[PDB]
């Protein structure tokens, strides 16, 4: 319990490198790594039974990782902002440059 409002932890930049991927439980760490393997060593974060996160080095890759999910129906990939957007939405016009 503490009073007053001060600073402390720095602020993190837009979560672009991160990608929200939702795959079926049937999947596994092998399916993820292997899939994204195209890029190389990555950090797969297990959130929920069907919720996972992906981390990349360069933003460019994002494009591809997104162009692949387009046709891919089994799984779905989207930008961190795009994903969260649904859950919470501040005050800023929204746009859907992708299916939807």
Curated annotation (Swiss-Prot):
Q: List-wise, which residues carry N6-acetyllysine?
A: 70
- Please describe the post-translational modifications of this protein: Phosphorylation by MAPKAPK2, preventing GADD45A mRNA degradation after genotoxic stress.
Q: Where in the cell is it found?
A: Nucleus; Cytoplasm; Nucleus, Nucleolus
* SUBUNIT field: Homodimer. Found in a mRNA decay complex with RENT1, RENT2 and RENT3B. Interacts with KHSRP. Interacts with CELF1/CUGBP1. Interacts with ZC3HAV1 in an RNA-independent manner. Interacts with DHX36.
Q: What does this protein do?
A: 3'-exoribonuclease that has a preference for poly(A) tails of mRNAs, thereby efficiently degrading poly(A) tails. Exonucleolytic degradation of the poly(A) tail is often the first step in the decay of eukaryotic mRNAs and is also used to silence certain maternal mRNAs translationally during oocyte maturation and early embryonic development. Interacts with both the 3'-end poly(A) tail and the 5'-end cap structure during degradation, the interaction with the cap structure being required for an efficient degradation of poly(A) tails.
Family that this chain belongs to: Belongs to the CAF1 family.
Q: How is this protein named in the record?
A: Poly(A)-specific ribonuclease PARN
Q: What gene is it encoded by? A: Parn
């Amino acid at each position: 319990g503490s009073s007053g409002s001060s600073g402390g932890p720095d602020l993190q930049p837009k979560r672009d490198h991160v990608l929200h991927v939702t795959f079926p439980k049937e999947w596994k760490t092998s399916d993820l790594y292997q899939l994204f393997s195209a890029f190389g060593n990555i950090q797969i974060s297990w959130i929920d039974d069907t919720s996972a996160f992906v981390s990349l080095s360069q933003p460019e890759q994002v494009q591809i990782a997104v162009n692949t999910s387009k046709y891919a129906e089994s799984y779905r990939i989207q930008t961190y902002a795009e994903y969260v957007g649904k859950k919470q939405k501040g005050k800023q016009v929204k746009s859907g440059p992708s299916s939807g």
